[PDB]
Amino acid sequence: KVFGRCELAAAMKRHGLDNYRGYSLGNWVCAAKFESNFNTQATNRNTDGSTDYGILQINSRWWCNDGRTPGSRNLCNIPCSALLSSDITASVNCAKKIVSDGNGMNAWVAWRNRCKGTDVQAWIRGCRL
Ligand SMILES: CC(=O)N[C@@H]1[C@@H](O)[C@H](O)[C@@H](CO)O[C@@H]1O
Ligand SMILES: [Cl-]
Ligand SMILES: [Cl-]
Ligand SMILES: [Cl-]
Ligand SMILES: [Cl-]
Ligand code: NA
Numbered sequence: 001k002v003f004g005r006c007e008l009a010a011a012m013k014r015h016g017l018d019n020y021r022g023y024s025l026g027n028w029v030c031a032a033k034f035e036s037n038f039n040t041q042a043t044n045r046n047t048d049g050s051t052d053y054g055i056l057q058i059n060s061r062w063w064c065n066d067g068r069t070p071g072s073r074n075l076c077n078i079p080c081s082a083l084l085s086s087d088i089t090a091s092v093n094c095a096k097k098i099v100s101d102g103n104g105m106n107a108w109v110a111w112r113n114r115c116k117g118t119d120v121q122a123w124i125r126g127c128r129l
Helices: 005-014 025-036 080-084 089-099 109-114
Strands: 043-045 051-053
Touching: 005 025, 025 109, 051 080, 080 089
Parallel strands: none
Antiparallel strands: 043 051
């Protein structure tokens, strides 16, 4: 499912993401924009063999199991395919574990390079929240 900008912001807001660990809702919307282009079914292979999954491109190296990342972790205790569903519940819950790992939203390379320090609030303006 390819989310609308305000549709994704409302879904992230309903699942408790806005101001989670001090990151306002605009940061999460901006991150999903540049990680997956609002597409829950996005996947991208990495050089080390792991794969990013879903609306926030959560990596199978640490957070989910896809059966093909040898010596990896499954800290969110889910199959990576669950991160591709039209329901973003699993992606949001796993993201809350990632952002609480000590490095904040810097775990998402797209957010650090394309959202951090910008006017992230602009990604939720015009939305009826
Ligand atoms: C939080 C998370 O899983 N981030 C991943 C990370 O593995 C990496 O920096 C990159 C790989 O292309 O994509 C995503 O940002
Ligand atoms: Cl914001
Ligand atoms: Cl694996
Ligand atoms: Cl949803
Ligand atoms: Cl932080
Ligand atoms: Na894994």
